[PDB]
C-alpha cells in the first residue's frame, strides 16, 4: 500500500475523445498516472436512434462492436504495463441521454443497456464485479443521478466530487464516497483532478480501496 | 487486380514547380507511370501575404484560381488517358507554412483552407472523398508539426508518406503506419523516385480504397 | 510474369534459428510468401572455434554437414511446393565476424570458405550461379563501410530488413532487396520483396539481379 | 537631470506574468522605481497557433486586443504618476520563438508583426519612435548569435537580466541597458538601469540611446 495516482474516467476517439488510444494511453502514461480507465460511451437506444437519423456521429461503441472494444483494451492493458508500469483497466460510461443518467464502469466484462432502469444497470454490473461511479456532468455541459442523491445513497461504489478543473461540493457535504477524474476528451484534460488512493498495485485492491473510500484523496495534477 | 504503378506527390509551374503542366504529364505518362496525381500548392493566407509583400511569387494557387486549376487537370485526365493509358487524379498539396504541416489531398474537388486545424482540414477531405496523405518534408529541408505528432494523427491519415525522392522514412514503418511512396516532383530528375506500387483494378475509387487498406502497398525506386 | 512474394534471408534450428525447417516452411507458406530462401549460416573458423571452447552452441552448419543441410533442403522443395504451391531455394548466409561481413547466396550447391576475401566468395558463388546479397546488419561492417569498391560486386544489397529500412542502399540507387533475416516465429511478419517474375528460380534470380521490377512490402499481422 | 532607476522590461498576467497590471505597479511604485515600462508578449503566428490547438495559455496578447492593452496602459500611466510619481512608458516584448529573437520595444504605439524579419520589426518600431532593445534570454538565440550584423541595429543590448550579467555586451562595448525581465514577486530584486535624464519619456529614451550616462545597479532586499 502507496499511495496511486489514478484517472478512471477517461474517452478516445473509439466514442466521443478526439483522440487515438495508443496516444491516450501515452499521455496518462509518461505524466506518470498509475492507474487508468478507459470509459468510452455505450448509448441508450433511443439516443443511437435519433443521431442515425440525423445523421450525426453515433460517439458511442455498439453493441456488435463492445467485445472488440474490449480486445483493444486488453491489448493495451499489456503495453500500458510494460512501457510505463501503468494498470489500465477496461471500463465503459453508460450513457442515458433520454433519462439523463451517466454511469461509470470500472473494469467491465459486458455489455449493459444504457436504457435499464439505474438500479438493474448497476445490479447488471456488480455481477460483473466492476465498481460502479455516478458520474457528473461536466461544467462546459436536472440530472436523475444527483437530483436523487438520497434514493441512491447506498446505490453507488463512487460519486464524482469532482471531473475536469472543478469540485462539486454537494458529494462532500453529504460525506458520500468519493473519486475524481479527468472526464477526458481532449490533449489538455489530462491536466485535471485526479483519484490518490492508498492501495496495492492490483485492480481487485483499487476496486475494494475506491469502495471503501477511507484511503482515498483527490489531487489536482497541474 | 494487377498491380499499378503510382506517384501521388508532383508539383508543376501552376505552383511551385519548374515545368508546365503537359510536360509533367508527357513525362510521366512516358516513364509508363500508372497512376499520377498532381497536387499544386494552396498555400496558409499569412504565408501567402508576406510573399505577396515581399513581392516573391505566390508558388501556389489562389482561391479565387482554384476551380480553373481543377478545369485544367480535368481536361489533363482526357490526354493522359488518350495517349498514355494514364489515370491523372486532380490534387493539391495543403500547405500551412506558418504551423508546418503539408497535406496531400488526392481526388479534391473544393478548395479548402490551410490555416484550418489538421483535423478540420481532414474532415473536409472526407466529405469530398478525397485520400489524405501526411507528407513528409524532403531531405533537402524545422520540427514538422505532424511528424512531432504521429500517435496523436494515427487515425486521420489514410497514408503516411515513407518516402519521398530518393529518400526513405523510417519512421513511417517502424510505427507500421499505413505508407505511400512519391516523388514530391518538382523537376525533371524527380521523376526517378520512390513511387507506390498498389494492387487495384484501374479506377480512381479502387485506388484509394486499395492505399486506405494499405495491405497490397509495396514501395519502388524508379531510376534511370 | 505475375508479382511474387518473396524472402530471401531465413533461418532455422540448423543454425541459429529457433525453428525447425518443417514449421519455418509451414509459416511462410500459410502466410502467402511464395518464394523463400532458407540461408543458415556457415561461418568463418575463428568464430565456429571460439564457440566449441566456451561451449557455445555452434549456431551454424559445419562445413561436413553441409552437403546433409543442402540434401534437406532440397526435399523440403517438393514439400514447399507441393503443400503451398511456394518456392523453396536452398541457400546460405556465409558469416564472417571476424571480418564482419555477411554474405547472402541464394540457390547455392556447394559450401565456401567465409574466411576467404569477399572477392573471392562472390567468385566462387558466381560460378555456381547462385544469387549475391550483401546483407545488412539488423537494428539490434565491412560491405558497408566499402559500398563504392563493392558496387559491381553484388546482385543486390538489404535495404530492409525485419522493421527496419536502409537509407543509404537507396540513396545510392544500388541494387536491393528486403528480407525478414527469420530467426523466431515473429520474424515473418518483416519487409520482404515483390519481384515481376515468371515463377521460377532462374527467373527469379534473373529479376533481382535486373532490379527493374522490384519493390519493397511491409507484411503486417 | 538626477540618476534614475529604470525597468524596462516587465511582464503582467495580461501575458504570461504571475500578477495584474494594477500590483506591478504598486511593487515597482513602492520599491522606488523612478520609470518602469510594461513589455507584456506579443508573438509569432506559429507558436500563437500551436498553444491555441494544445489547449495551453496564450501567454500573448493578440492583434485584435493590442490596442485594448495599450489603453490599459495609457490609463495606468495617470495612476503610477499620482500615487508614486513613476513614469510608467507602455512597450512590448516582440516575442519570436520560431526564428528566436525577443525585442523589447519602450514607447510603442501600434502592434508589430513577431514573425517579419529583424530588421522590418525595427524599421517599423523607429517609425513609431519607440525605443529598440535586443533582450537576452534569461538564465534559466539569433541576435546573440550574430551581433556584428545587429551593431547598428539596436538603440541597445541587454546586458543584465534578472540576477545576472551578460559580459559578452560589455566585452563589444555595445550599448546597453538592464532589467528585471519580470514575471514573478521576487523578481523585483534584479538589475536595474540607473539614467542620467531629466524625468520625462523623450528624455530617456534620448538618454539610453546616447548611452553616455547609463550604468547597471542590482537592487536587492
Ligand atoms: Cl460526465
Ligand atoms: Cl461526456
Ligand atoms: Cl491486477
Ligand atoms: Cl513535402
Ligand atoms: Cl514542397
Ligand atoms: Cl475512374
Ligand atoms: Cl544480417
Ligand atoms: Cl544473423
Ligand atoms: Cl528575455
Ligand atoms: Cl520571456
Ligand atoms: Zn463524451
Ligand atoms: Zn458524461
Ligand atoms: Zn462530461
Ligand atoms: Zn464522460
Ligand atoms: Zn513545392
Ligand atoms: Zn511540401
Ligand atoms: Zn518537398
Ligand atoms: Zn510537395
Ligand atoms: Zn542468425
Ligand atoms: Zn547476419
Ligand atoms: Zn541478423
Ligand atoms: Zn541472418
Ligand atoms: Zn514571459
Ligand atoms: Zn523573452
Ligand atoms: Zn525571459
Ligand atoms: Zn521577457
Known amino acids: 500500500?502507496?499511495?496511486?495516482?489514478?484517472?478512471?474516467?477517461?474517452?478516445?476517439?473509439?466514442?466521443?475523445?478526439?483522440?487515438?488510444?495508443?496516444?491516450?494511453?501515452?499521455?496518462?502514461?509518461?505524466?506518470?498516472?498509475?492507474?487508468?480507465?478507459?470509459?468510452?460511451?455505450?448509448?441508450?437506444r433511443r439516443t443511437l436512434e435519433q443521431r442515425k437519423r440525423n445523421g450525426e456521429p453515433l460517439g458511442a461503441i455498439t453493441e456488435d462492436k463492445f467485445q472488440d472494444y474490449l480486445k483493444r483494451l486488453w491489448r493495451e492493458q499489456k503495453r500500458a504495463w510494460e512501457e510505463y508500469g501503468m494498470i489500465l483497466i477496461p471500463g465503459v460510461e453508460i450513457t442515458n441521454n433520454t433519462d439523463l443518467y451517466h454511469i461509470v464502469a470500472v473494469d467491465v466484462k459486458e455489455y449493459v443497456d444504457?436504457?435499464?432502469?439505474?438500479?438493474?444497470?448497476?445490479?447488471?454490473?456488480?455481477?460483473?464485479?466492476?465498481?460502479?461511479?455516478?458520474?457528473?456532468?461536466?461544467?462546459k455541459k436536472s440530472w436523475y443521478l444527483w437530483a436523487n442523491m438520497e434514493r441512491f445513497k447506498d446505490t453507488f461504489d463512487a460519486w464524482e466530487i469532482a471531473n475536469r478543473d472543478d469540485l462539486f461540493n454537494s458529494v462532500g457535504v453529504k460525506k458520500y464516497?468519493?473519486?475524481?477524474?479527468?472526464?477526458?476528451?481532449?490533449?489538455?484534460?489530462?491536466?485535471?483532478?485526479?483519484?490518490?488512493?492508498?492501495?496495492?498495485?492490483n485492480i481487485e485492491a483499487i476496486k475494494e480501496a475506491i469502495r471503501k473510500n477511507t484511503d482515498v484523496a483527490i489531487y489536482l495534477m497541474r
Open 177 to 201: 464516497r468519493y473519486v475524481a477524474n479527468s472526464d477526458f476528451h481532449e490533449l489538455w484534460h489530462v491536466y485535471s483532478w485526479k483519484t490518490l488512493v492508498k492501495s496495492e498495485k
Open 114 to 139: 444504457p436504457s435499464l432502469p439505474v438500479e438493474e444497470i448497476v445490479e447488471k454490473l456488480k455481477e460483473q464485479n466492476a465498481l460502479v461511479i455516478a458520474a457528473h456532468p461536466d461544467r
Open 1 to 44: 500500500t502507496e499511495w496511486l495516482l489514478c484517472d478512471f474516467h477517461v474517452h478516445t476517439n473509439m466514442s466521443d475523445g478526439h483522440l487515438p488510444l495508443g496516444e491516450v494511453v501515452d499521455l496518462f502514461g509518461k505524466h506518470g498516472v498509475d492507474v487508468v480507465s478507459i470509459t468510452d460511451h455505450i448509448v441508450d
